[PDB]
Amino acid sequence: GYKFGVLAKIVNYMKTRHQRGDTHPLTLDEILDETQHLDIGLKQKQWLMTEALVNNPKIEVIDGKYAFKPKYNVR
Amino acid sequence: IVTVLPVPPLSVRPAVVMQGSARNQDDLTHKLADIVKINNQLRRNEQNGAAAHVIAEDVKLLQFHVATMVDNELPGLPRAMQKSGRPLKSLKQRLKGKEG
Amino acid sequence: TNYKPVANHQYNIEYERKKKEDGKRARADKQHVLDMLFSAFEKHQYYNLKDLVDITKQPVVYLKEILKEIGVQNVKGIHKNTWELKPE
Amino acid sequence: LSTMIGKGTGAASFDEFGNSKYQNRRTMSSSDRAMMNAFKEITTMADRINLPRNIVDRTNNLFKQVYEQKSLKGRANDAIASACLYIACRQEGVPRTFKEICAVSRISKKEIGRCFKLILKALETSVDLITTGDFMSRFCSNLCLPKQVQMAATHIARKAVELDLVPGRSPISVAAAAIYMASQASAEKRTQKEIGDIAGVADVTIRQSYRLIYPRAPDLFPTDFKFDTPVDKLPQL
Amino acid sequence: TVPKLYRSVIEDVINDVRDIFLDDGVDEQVLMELKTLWENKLMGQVEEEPLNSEDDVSDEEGQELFDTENVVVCQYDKIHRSKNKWKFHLKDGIMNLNGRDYIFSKAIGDAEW
Amino acid sequence: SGIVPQLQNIVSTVNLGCKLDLKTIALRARNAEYNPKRFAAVIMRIREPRTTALIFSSGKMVCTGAKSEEQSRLAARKYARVVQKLGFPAKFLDFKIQNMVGSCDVKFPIRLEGLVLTHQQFSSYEPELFPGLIYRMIKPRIVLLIFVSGKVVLTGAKVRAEIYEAFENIYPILKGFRK
Amino acid sequence: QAPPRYLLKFEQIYLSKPTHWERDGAPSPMMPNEARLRNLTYSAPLYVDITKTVIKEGEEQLQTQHQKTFIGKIPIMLRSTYCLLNGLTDRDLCELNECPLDPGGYFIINGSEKVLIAQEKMATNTVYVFAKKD
Amino acid sequence: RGMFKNLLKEVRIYAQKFIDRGKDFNLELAIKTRIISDGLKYSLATGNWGDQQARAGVSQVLNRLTFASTLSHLRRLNSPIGRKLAKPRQLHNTLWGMVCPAETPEGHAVGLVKNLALMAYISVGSQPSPILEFLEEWS
Amino acid sequence: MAYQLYRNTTLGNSLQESLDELIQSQQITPQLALQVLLQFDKAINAALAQRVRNRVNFRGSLNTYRFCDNVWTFVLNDVEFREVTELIKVDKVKIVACD
């Protein structure tokens, strides 16, 4: 299993991180540090950057970094 | 075009009484039972909005039952069969031929 | 000599012995069952509810509870409706 | 009140690809279909041990009463059917041992006994206590023993039970011991294996029933019986 | 017997770790030296909420803490409790009785309590 | 009558009122066994009362094997103290006695056949299933196990007093069928 | 097939004398007169020998044998080789309440003496050229 | 043959239902003894020759009015021709010595119901194997 | 990620000490030490399962016993190890077993 499992882990981690009030964006390495994914492949990284965090309606692209999308949802 | 089906009285379709306690019913009573069952099924399917092909098949089966009400010698069609090998005696059977 | 009286059939007692040696499938924490789910849809895209239960070795109600949160059921006109392990 | 659709007869009956456009879509209830499945299973069970049809009818009556009374929804219909067959056999004066009904069912002695207890509770009825006598015609005939041995075994078991020689032993065990210790008194002999496998008793059950019944040997036999073997020649295990 | 088992274990271990060492680039010289060192290391209370009415209802808890005495390390297959005693079907395991090593493949144990 | 029943086992339920974690209790206890694949609770056993108790995650304690109601309460307090030793804030609420089991003797054999014949609506004697007569009697909630040995077992009572009057209710009946 | 593979083979057929099971379950010889009077069916049990084998990936084949498995009752033609009246002499027939002059050759089904009438059929396996002019 | 096929089908269904459910199956319980018994009995009782488009009148109540009547009934032959078609009703030449030229019913069944001659014998068949071996061994 | 029962032994203690000495010299990473421990556990488990075909007996009395996550913790006192070749007397023994 590879290239398809960690996407669920990272999206869940960032969603739960936003649930704690972390409105500030976080870099990819910041999430990778505490998710025990230091051995993640480079092609996985670029595939993530090019598809995963841009196609989903739950990730906001601001000042180059990635954050939640609380404006789209109801609060 | 049969839109309301006449239901014969009990005289036309009497229930015989056997040895012991029995309520053996005429063939027409069984055919009326099937007619009412399929009619209720179709009514409920139309009421709760079933699939189109479900309604079409139920209409087809209702047509078959109303057909075997009258004619059981439909050429190239299955016969209304009671349980054990006996075709039902439809109205045309009750009327035509030597024992009619 | 046939249909001889017996307290219980050999196959039945064998099946009960197997069932009581193996026991019931124990309820686990959410993360570890989710780890089996992750290995699962890494292994194969589509799945059948029975095979998922066999692979995960988890209680059917608990599997349904942890799968409904992330998974959805897709209707198919070929065989039967089935669950989808993709979160989206 | 429903009727079947017969096989197709011509082109109009069939469809574009090798199938009839009318099918046997039965309108049976879940309840009626489940209880018809049960009657069909009861008949199969009863014909395995050659029960007459009257016992099958009584079993159907008891099963219908239980299934309408609706207190055992949680037990398999096959276990309720087995218990009903046991009750029907016991009510007719021709009881079958629990192991005999078990042998013709997928349901264990544990499960059929529990369902029997629960059916008796539900119907608020009772059944006569089995005597080491009813289980004699079968346990003997199956073992192929003469008619004088029938009378000897019946009389001796009845006398042993009457004077309370055996405390609390199940009637099956006392009956089997009677068969054992009346068989050796005649020319026709039967070993432990045959009687045990034909009556359901274990070797240790029949052995301790024999050792309990042995000392009162001569006073227990019928007076008018041909002693093909002397009373003192019975071998003690 | 026991030294022969030790030598066979050493042979199997060194044969097994060859692929592991060659996978990550560990040279052979690390193994032999380690082995040498390894060998050199071997050779009427109405209101019932307060529960403090009782004391000294526990035994010494240090027995698990010290672990200085002999300890059985093995695996189990079948254990039965029969109102008085525990019947054990203990499969293969190793033992260290007062420094001397022992081995067994099957055992029957009896315990009283 | 002249013979007094003796209670041989007691079981009671008591609500601690707080949720518990089973794994930590099994780890930090002294006589705790827990197999997840077998059963939903942690058994615990204490020698001096010879009582056993079951720890459930919803915090309802159940005790077994006590010889007296006061002994059962003391054992329940002991198990609650064992829970408190882990720092879990348990309580002692709605302690309700549930069942006690009594064994006694009449010292004469009984002909069970007459007993089940004259009390068919109460008795059910099946030698194949179980060698003892089961006697279910109405106004008390009580079932009796009777045997040819004379031994009698009383069970199903709610309170200690309840056991007694049933015994003297069956003793004359039993006295009418002395072998 | 469910992995195990189960194989059943039916080898030998046995067929005992006609028998009757009373309410007690005691088998006794069904005499034909008794069948006629009590509306019984004059049938004999049919027993078959079955071999059961199991194929497992671990090569643990069993060859278990169920000897003489009851598989139903065949009605028996009277005065045939498998009837109770086969070798009986005239005196034995009279003592058994059966006419010596009875030819037999009929079954007893529910107490009715049922006879099978030979049915004519076109000969099989032979070429036949006919004269369809219609 | 058909009813043994039905029995084997039922055993297969039962044993498949047990094997897929994941347990060995008891052979004795799989066999439904009802099938052969109450199928042969039904066919010989009602005369309908087939399952419970089939021949009728194959089995009849034996005629016990006179010994001659019983013998005549036990030696009867039936032609399945419908009861039209005068040709099969005629007394063909090949009936000499095999079928009685006199014994037929009068009415709707004349000619179609016949009786064996007094020395007529119907072969029970035999295996053609030894004939084939002999012929092959011959020239 | 294994049974992990032979680690708390004299052999396990010696291996752990050797790995600690190697780590303190900055020769191998701790992950390689863990991998070596896992391989050693697998090897000793296989050796015990295969090359052991002998039997021993023991008797004693129990005082303490526990069970958690397929791990027994029996304790025996006044234990006599009986064997056909040698008899051993020991005061107190602790039994840890897994499956």
TrEMBL record, chain B:
Superkingdom in the source lineage: Eukaryota
Localization in the cell: Chromosome; Cytoplasm; Nucleus
Q: What does this protein do?
A: DNA-dependent RNA polymerase catalyzes the transcription of DNA into RNA using the four ribonucleoside triphosphates as substrates. RNA-dependent RNA polymerase that catalyzes the extension of a non-coding RNA (ncRNA) at the 3'-end using the four ribonucleoside triphosphates as substrates. An internal ncRNA sequence near the 3'-end serves as a template in a single-round Pol II-mediated RNA polymerization reaction. May decrease the stability of ncRNAs that repress Pol II-mediated gene transcription.
Name the protein family: Belongs to the RNA polymerase beta' chain family.
Q: What protein name does the entry list?
A: DNA-directed RNA polymerase subunit
**Which organism is this protein's natural source?**
Sus scrofa (Pig)
Q: Which residues of the full protein are shown?
A: 249 to 348 of 1984
TrEMBL record, chain H:
User: Where located?
Assistant: Nucleus
Residues of the RNA polymerase Rpb2 domain: 60-122
The lineage's top-level taxon is Eukaryota
Q: What is the protein's known function?
A: RNA-dependent RNA polymerase that catalyzes the extension of a non-coding RNA (ncRNA) at the 3'-end using the four ribonucleoside triphosphates as substrates. An internal ncRNA sequence near the 3'-end serves as a template in a single-round Pol II-mediated RNA polymerization reaction. May decrease the stability of ncRNAs that repress Pol II-mediated gene transcription.
Give the family per the record.
Answer: Belongs to the RNA polymerase beta chain family.
> What's the protein name?
DNA-directed RNA polymerase subunit beta
The species is Sus scrofa (Pig)
